[PDB]
Coordinates of C-alpha atoms (C1' of nucleotides) in Angstrom, one line a residue:
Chain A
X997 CA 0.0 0.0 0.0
X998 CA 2.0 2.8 0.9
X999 CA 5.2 3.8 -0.8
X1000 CA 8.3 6.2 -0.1
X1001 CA 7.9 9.1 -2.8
X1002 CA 9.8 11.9 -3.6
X1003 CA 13.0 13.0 -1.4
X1004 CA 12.5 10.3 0.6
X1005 CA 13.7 7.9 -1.9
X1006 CA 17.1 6.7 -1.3
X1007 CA 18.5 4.9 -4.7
X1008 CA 20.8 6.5 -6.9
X1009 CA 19.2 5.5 -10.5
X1010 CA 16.0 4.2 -11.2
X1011 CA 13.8 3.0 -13.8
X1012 CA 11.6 5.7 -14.5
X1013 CA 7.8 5.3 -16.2
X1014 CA 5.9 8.3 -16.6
X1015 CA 2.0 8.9 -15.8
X1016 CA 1.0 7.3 -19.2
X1017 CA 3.4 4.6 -19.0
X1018 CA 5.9 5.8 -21.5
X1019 CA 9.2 4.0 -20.4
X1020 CA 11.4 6.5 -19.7
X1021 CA 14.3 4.2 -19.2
X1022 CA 16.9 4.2 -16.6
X1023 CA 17.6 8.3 -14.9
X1024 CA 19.3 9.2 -11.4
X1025 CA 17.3 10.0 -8.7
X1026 CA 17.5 13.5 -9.7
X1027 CA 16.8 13.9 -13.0
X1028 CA 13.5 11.9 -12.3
X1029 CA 12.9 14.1 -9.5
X1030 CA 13.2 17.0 -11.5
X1031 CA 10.9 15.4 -14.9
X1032 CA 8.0 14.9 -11.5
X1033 CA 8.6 18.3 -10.3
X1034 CA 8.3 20.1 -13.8
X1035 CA 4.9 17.8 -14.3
X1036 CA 3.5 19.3 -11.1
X1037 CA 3.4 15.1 -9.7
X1038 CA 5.4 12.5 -7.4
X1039 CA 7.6 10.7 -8.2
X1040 CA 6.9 7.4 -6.6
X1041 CA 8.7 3.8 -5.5
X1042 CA 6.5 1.7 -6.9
X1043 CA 9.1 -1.3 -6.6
X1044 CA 11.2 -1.0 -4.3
X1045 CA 13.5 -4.1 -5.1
X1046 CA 13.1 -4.4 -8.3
X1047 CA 16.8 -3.7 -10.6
X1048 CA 17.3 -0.7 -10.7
X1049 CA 14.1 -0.2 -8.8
X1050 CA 11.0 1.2 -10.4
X1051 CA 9.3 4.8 -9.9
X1052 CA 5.9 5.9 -11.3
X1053 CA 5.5 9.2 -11.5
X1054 CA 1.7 10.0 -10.2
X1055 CA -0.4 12.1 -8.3
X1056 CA 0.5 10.4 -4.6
X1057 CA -2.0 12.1 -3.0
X1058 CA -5.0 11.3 -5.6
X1059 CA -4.0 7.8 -5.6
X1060 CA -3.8 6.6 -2.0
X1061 CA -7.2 8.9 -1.8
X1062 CA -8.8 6.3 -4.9
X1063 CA -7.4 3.1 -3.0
X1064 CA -8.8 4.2 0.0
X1065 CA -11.9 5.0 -1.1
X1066 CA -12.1 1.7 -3.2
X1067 CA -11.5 -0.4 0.1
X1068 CA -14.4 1.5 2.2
X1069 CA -16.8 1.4 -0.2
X1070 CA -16.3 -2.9 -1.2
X1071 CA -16.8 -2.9 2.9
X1072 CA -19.9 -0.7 3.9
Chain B
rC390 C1' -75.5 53.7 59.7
rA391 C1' -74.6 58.9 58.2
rA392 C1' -71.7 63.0 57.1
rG393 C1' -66.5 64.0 56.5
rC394 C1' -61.0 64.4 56.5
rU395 C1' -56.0 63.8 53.3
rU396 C1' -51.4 61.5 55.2
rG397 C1' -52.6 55.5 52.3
rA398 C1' -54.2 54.6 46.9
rG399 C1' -55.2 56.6 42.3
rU400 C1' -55.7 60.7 38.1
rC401 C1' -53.5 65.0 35.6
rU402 C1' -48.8 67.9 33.4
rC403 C1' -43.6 68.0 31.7
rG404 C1' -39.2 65.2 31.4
rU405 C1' -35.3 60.8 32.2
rA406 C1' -32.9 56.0 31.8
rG407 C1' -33.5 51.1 30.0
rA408 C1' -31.1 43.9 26.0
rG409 C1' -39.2 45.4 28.9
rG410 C1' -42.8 43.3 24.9
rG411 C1' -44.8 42.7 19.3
rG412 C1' -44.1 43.6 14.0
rG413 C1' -41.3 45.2 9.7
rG414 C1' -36.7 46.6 7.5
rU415 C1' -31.4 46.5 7.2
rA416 C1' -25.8 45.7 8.3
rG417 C1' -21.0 43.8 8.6
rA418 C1' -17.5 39.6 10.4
rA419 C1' -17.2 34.3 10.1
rU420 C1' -18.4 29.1 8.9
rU421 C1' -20.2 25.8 4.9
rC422 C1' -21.4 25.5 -0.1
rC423 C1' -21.2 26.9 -5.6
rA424 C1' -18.1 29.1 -9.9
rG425 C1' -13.3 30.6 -11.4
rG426 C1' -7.4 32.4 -11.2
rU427 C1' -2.5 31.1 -8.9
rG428 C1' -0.2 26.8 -7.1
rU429 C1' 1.2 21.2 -6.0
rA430 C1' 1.3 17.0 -2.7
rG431 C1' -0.5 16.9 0.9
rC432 C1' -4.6 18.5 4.1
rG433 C1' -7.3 17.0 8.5
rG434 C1' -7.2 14.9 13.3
rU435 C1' -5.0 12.9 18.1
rG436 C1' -1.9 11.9 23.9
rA437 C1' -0.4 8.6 19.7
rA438 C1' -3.4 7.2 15.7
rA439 C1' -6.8 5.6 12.2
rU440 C1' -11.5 6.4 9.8
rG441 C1' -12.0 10.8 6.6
rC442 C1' -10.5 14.4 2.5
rG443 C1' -6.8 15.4 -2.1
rU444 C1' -3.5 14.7 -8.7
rA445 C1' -11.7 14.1 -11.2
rG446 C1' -5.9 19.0 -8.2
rA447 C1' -7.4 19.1 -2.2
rG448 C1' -5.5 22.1 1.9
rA449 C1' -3.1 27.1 1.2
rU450 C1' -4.0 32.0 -1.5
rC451 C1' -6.9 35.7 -4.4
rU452 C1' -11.8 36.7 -6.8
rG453 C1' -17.2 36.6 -7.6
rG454 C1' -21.9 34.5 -5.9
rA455 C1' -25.7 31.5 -2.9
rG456 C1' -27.7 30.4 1.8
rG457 C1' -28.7 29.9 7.0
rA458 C1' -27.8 31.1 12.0
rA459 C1' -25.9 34.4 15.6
rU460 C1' -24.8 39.4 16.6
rA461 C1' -17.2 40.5 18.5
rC462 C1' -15.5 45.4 20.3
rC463 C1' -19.2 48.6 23.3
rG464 C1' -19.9 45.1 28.0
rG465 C1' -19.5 46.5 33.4
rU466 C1' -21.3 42.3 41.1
rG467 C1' -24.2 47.4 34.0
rG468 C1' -29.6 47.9 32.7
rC469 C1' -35.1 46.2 32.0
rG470 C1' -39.1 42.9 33.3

RNA sequence: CAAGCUUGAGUCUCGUAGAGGGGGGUAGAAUUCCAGGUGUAGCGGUGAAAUGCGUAGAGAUCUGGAGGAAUACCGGUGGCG
């Protein structure tokens, strides 16, 4: 469920895949940080131990908000 | 029982203070909501959290509008009944 996004992600490169899921291929940690930033989005760990591991960049914020929201409703 | 008397009690005149009552108008602050601009990943909440809300862009900021409810300061062993 919840990942480490943004500054708090510790790897030097990762495998970067955009919000469409263009393949961006494999960028330091802050190059991708900067492609998030100029998108106005997070750049997020979405596998963590994967090689090099993989970051999505997404809206963090509107997606843990759509997961929760998913899990509530199936349960009420 | 009858006549009175004017101090009790009323009536008259002119003023005073008051959130006293009833009706009708109207005002500016704020909350929530609606519509937009800027902006971007959090906001919110607690002892700590989680539920909740936010990339269908929240929260924060600026702008316009809707609506309801209550009237900060004045304000006070102040006032009225």
């Amino acid at each position: 469920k919840d990942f480490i996004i943004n500054e708090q992600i510790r790897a030097r490169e990762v495998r970067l895949i955009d919000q469409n899921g263009d393949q961006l291929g494999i960028k330091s940690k802050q190059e991708a940080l900067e492609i998030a930033a100029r998108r106005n989005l997070d750049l997020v760990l979405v596998a963590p131990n994967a090689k090099p591991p993989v970051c999505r960049i997404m809206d963090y914020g509107k997606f843990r908000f759509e997961q929760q929201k998913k899990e509530k409703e199936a349960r009420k």
